[PDB]
RNA sequence: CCUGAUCAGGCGAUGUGUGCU
């Protein structure tokens, strides 16, 4: 399956392809109705 | 008169044309068995429904029998002789009603009778949906592996199933494989029927190369005969209708590219097209395609006909269980 | 909005409705074993949604109630004993039931 | 004024009485919902083998 | 897993102790 674990730092270009989106408010979840 | 029932029935998403005051007067029956439901006394339930003013009510049964059980819907003659004989034996007769009650718990009995009532309706659409075809040429995709039955999953939402005895022997199938076929029957199970098919027929190979042959529609060649023993090995002899065409070339296509094709159809099938002339001896002789034939000798009056070859062509014209030989022959 | 201590739940058989009162609050003296309710409180979860079959039948009865979840305190699971003492408490503004 | 006499006789040769009112009848059934009388009986005169003298 | 009739509804960290090995 896998043979070894590596380490490195991360730029940030790799950072941003981790990602799926951007978090852009402090909202924690809606009121009323249970959803985010 | 609240009229809530008046918008209620006009919702009108699925039941449009489905009937209205019917589905209207079953969640009444539906809510009255839950009335029913609440109390200990064990009466049978009747709702009564109005189509104008859209208000309803509850009326109890007392279901003139010859018996005792059932006590709260218990009626006899002898006590039908105060109400002078004028009930029979075996009636509902109602003579008592009920009034209402709030009853989460029956409220949820209700939601529950009405979910049922809707897949009743659901299943009776259905059937409809079947009403208007009966029985046709259809490909479906099976979804669910059952022991010697295979369900399948059609369009707008029907269904059918495929049985073993009515499929191929050796060749067994498996879910995301598309299977066409003949449905023949709607046999009524518990809670509705579902339909049924026969993919082993020489309909279908028969409807497979009309819908593959171009001449097949235009009546440039005729399809005289179609004979198939299912699966294993099939031979039809068809003509050109007066064209100097050939058939086989035409209901071939390309390289076997229609009956290669649509022997894919019947799962493997080994199918042979095969000549036709005039008279029944050329006809029957080049229907015992592929085979060479010497002589064939046949009887004016009672239709029997005898046929002789080389042992190098006996072995080719016997065929293993006589398919060649009763195909030639049916 | 705010939550009854009613008897009438739904989504649970006369099994475990069957040592409370028509109040809601088990009977004092009741031999109770792990898995029981001794409490019967039903929650609003909120509307949120509603769909056509729960219209017609909010149609039917009228109730508004309808989207109800239960909270209903229930038995440590293997405890057992015979409940000897309830206390309740209501503030103000609350009406009293027969049992307070 | 005991319950076996009036299961002796059928409910139906009950009905066969003005006796019997409209309520009366609804108590009929409502009594022998218990499954203990007016299942249309019949004995000798009163007494079965366990209503025997001891 | 638990509860009811294939569907619905229920899965905490810190700190303070205190007691056992």
């Known amino acids: ?36 | 008169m609240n009229k809530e029932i008046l918008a209620v029935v006009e919702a009108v998403s699925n039941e449009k044309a489905l009937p209205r005051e019917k589905i209207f007067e079953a969640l009444e029956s539906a809510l009255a068995t839950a009335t029913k439901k609440k109390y200990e006394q064990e009466i049978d339930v009747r709702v009564q429904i109005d189509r104008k003013s859209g208000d309803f009510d509850t009326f109890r049964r007392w279901l003139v029998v010859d018996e005792v059980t059932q006590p709260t819907k218990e009626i006899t003659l002898e006590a039908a002789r105060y109400e002078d004989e004028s009930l029979n034996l075996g009636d509902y007769v109602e003579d008592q009603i009920e009034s209402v009650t709030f009853d989460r718990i029956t409220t949820q009995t209700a939601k529950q009778v009405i979910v049922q009532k809707v897949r009743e309706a659901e299943r009776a659409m259905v059937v409809d949906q079947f009403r208007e075809h009966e029985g046709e040429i259809i490909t479906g995709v099976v979804k669910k592996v059952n022991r010697d039955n295979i369900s399948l999953d059609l369009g707008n939402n029907a269904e059918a199933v495929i049985l073993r005895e009515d499929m191929l022997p050796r060749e067994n199938f498996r879910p995301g494989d598309r299977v066409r076929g003949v449905l023949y029957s709607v046999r009524p199970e518990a809670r509705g029927a579902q339909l049924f098919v026969t993919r082993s027929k020489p309909e279908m190979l028969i409807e497979l190369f009309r819908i593959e042959v171009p001449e097949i529609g235009e009546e440039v060649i005729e399809i005289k005969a179609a004979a198939r023993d299912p699966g294993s090995r099939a031979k039809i002899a068809v003509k050109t209708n007066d064209k100097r065409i050939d058939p086989v070339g035409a209901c071939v296509g390309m390289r076997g590219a229609r009956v290669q094709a649509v022997s894919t159809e019947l799962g493997g099938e080994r199918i042979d097209i095969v000549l036709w002339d005039d008279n029944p001896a050329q006809f029957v002789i080049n229907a015992m395609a592929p085979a060479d034939v010497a002589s064939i000798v046949v009887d004016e009056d009672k239709h029997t006909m005898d046929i002789a070859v080389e042992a190098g062509n006996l072995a080719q014209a016997i065929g293993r269980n006589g398919q060649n030989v009763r195909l030639a022959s049916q | ?100 | ?54």
């Open chain 4, 1 to 54: 004024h005991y319950i076996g006499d009036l299961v002796q006789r059928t409910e139906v040769e009950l009905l066969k009485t003005p006796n019997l009112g409209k309520k009366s009848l609804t108590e009929i059934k409502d009594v022998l919902a218990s499954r203990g009388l007016s299942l249309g009986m019949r004995l000798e005169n009163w007494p079965p083998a366990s209503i025997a003298d001891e």
């Open chain 1, 1 to 36: 399956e896998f043979d070894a674990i590596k380490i490195a730092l991360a730029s940030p270009d790799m950072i941003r392809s981790w990602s799926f989106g951007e978090v852009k408010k402090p909202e924690t979840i809606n009121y009323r109705t249970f959803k985010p």
């Open chain 3, 1 to 100: 909005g705010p939550e009854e201590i009613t008897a009438d739940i739904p989504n649970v058989g006369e099994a475990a409705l069957s040592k409370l009162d028509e109040s809601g609050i088990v009977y004092i003296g009741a031999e109770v074993t792990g898995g029981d309710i001794l409490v019967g409180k039903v929650t609003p979860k909120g509307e949120t949604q509603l769909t056509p079959e729960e219209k017609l039948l909010r149609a039917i009865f009228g109730e508004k109630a309808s989207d109800v979840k239960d909270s209903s305190l229930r038995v440590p699971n293997g405890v057992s004993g015979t409940v000897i003492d309830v206390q309740v408490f209501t503030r103000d503004g609350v009406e009293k039931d027969k049992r307070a």
